[PDB]
């Protein structure tokens with residue numbers, strides 16, 4: 327029982343080389359075969375690497391797998407990037423009876439310039455508090471590529487309960503927007519000194535914080 | 542080298558049984574194990590069956606896998622169809638020289654009940670006003686089907702500039718969420734008595750109103 331940790335995203339221009347790392351949390355990376363899967367948006371998954379570095383028939387030489395024992399990491403390298411390489415890439419392995427997939431890496435083959443998001447965090451409105459709702463909204467606009475990861479904190483502690491995040495959406499300026507909202511009760515909201523919204527984009531992380539007031 | 546062929550789509554009504562076939566193109570279906578994965582749009586896939594007919598820990602017992610040796614096919618059978626079962630389903634087997642996936646079957650669950658949206662309108666945050674921004678956000682959640690019209694008002698008049706609405710995305714309750722945001726300056730925000738977000742869904746309107754803080 328172990329995790330495989332991949333970064334959330336990578337991006338490059340057509341024709342360049344990109345590397346996707348996959349770090350095993352406990353145990354040796356070399357003691358079990360590592361596979362790589364590609365899933366293009368709205369497509370079936372395809373195996374691009376099995377047994378660490380083996381390509382199935384039809385998978386071009388541009389895809390290369392490797393293992394690094396000292397890092398305890400596997401890597402998928404894609405050279406001569408093409409637009410059709412734009413996909414989610416997952417590593418998986420085993421130990422004992424456990425099958426383990428990594429969390430996935432979104433690879434974007436850049437189709438326009440990179441744009442860091444505007445992150446605005448809204449505390450509960452008066453209208454919803456009178457309805458025993460303390461829902462928070464994290465608004466994320468004007469970003470590219472259209473992939474983000476959102477994490478919420480109550481004080482310092484992570485929150486998984488009550489989190490919904492929209493699929494990013496192309497807006498009229500041709501950049502992506504999304505919202506994350508946290509469905510709190512006024513009780514939970516007033517019982518903490520602050521809440522935070524963490525937005526990660528192109529491996530850059532921004533944190534916004536709000537505290538209960540009165541007014 | 543073999544392939545797995547699944548229907549592109551199946552639609553069925555709630556409480557009824559649906560089958561999804563997965564045909565192996567060469568060799569015997571019984572010579573390697575078959576997995577089934579479920580994928581909701583937006584999310585990573587989830588394992589529903591391994592070793593032909595085994596369910597992992599989270600998975601409703603309404604999900605059953607089977608092997609038919611004569612037709613050289615695997616089947617996923619979902620009894621008592623729930624709207625939460627609407628998703629893409631992929632079968633998967635092994636070729637020793639590959640991990641093979643089917644093309645995917647899109648499962649539509651028909652006659653989903655209507656659900657009016659929860660609407661919440663947030664005035665500008667303190668933090669954004671300190672950075673000379675007065676963006677307003679209207680969270681629109683828990684609605685079905687997944688289309689809304691959003692109109693904004695300054696006092697009682699239609700707003701014609703600065704409105705973005707995101708494409709509704711299905712959330713973890715299998716209902717849609719979106720947010721509409723209006724990018725005002727501090728001046729526009731305080732030059733008016735109020736702003737309003739008007740949401741229409743299935744011929745029914747909801748209108749929320751907010752006004753500059755008095756503190």
Ligand SMILES: CCN(CC)c1ccc2c(C)c(CCN3C(=O)NC4(CCN(C(=O)c5cnc[nH]5)CC4)C3=O)c(=O)oc2c1
Nearest residue numbers: 363365371416425426427428429578585586587588591597
């Ligand atoms: C596109 C690549 N792909 C194939 C469709 C992925 C890509 C990613 C996943 C993930 C994230 C999970 C969910 C998390 N998860 C694991 O990492 N391992 C298991 C552990 C439990 N389990 C088993 O006990 C099992 C036994 N034999 C196979 N699976 C299912 C896999 C799991 O639930 C998963 O179950 O399946 C995945 C499949």
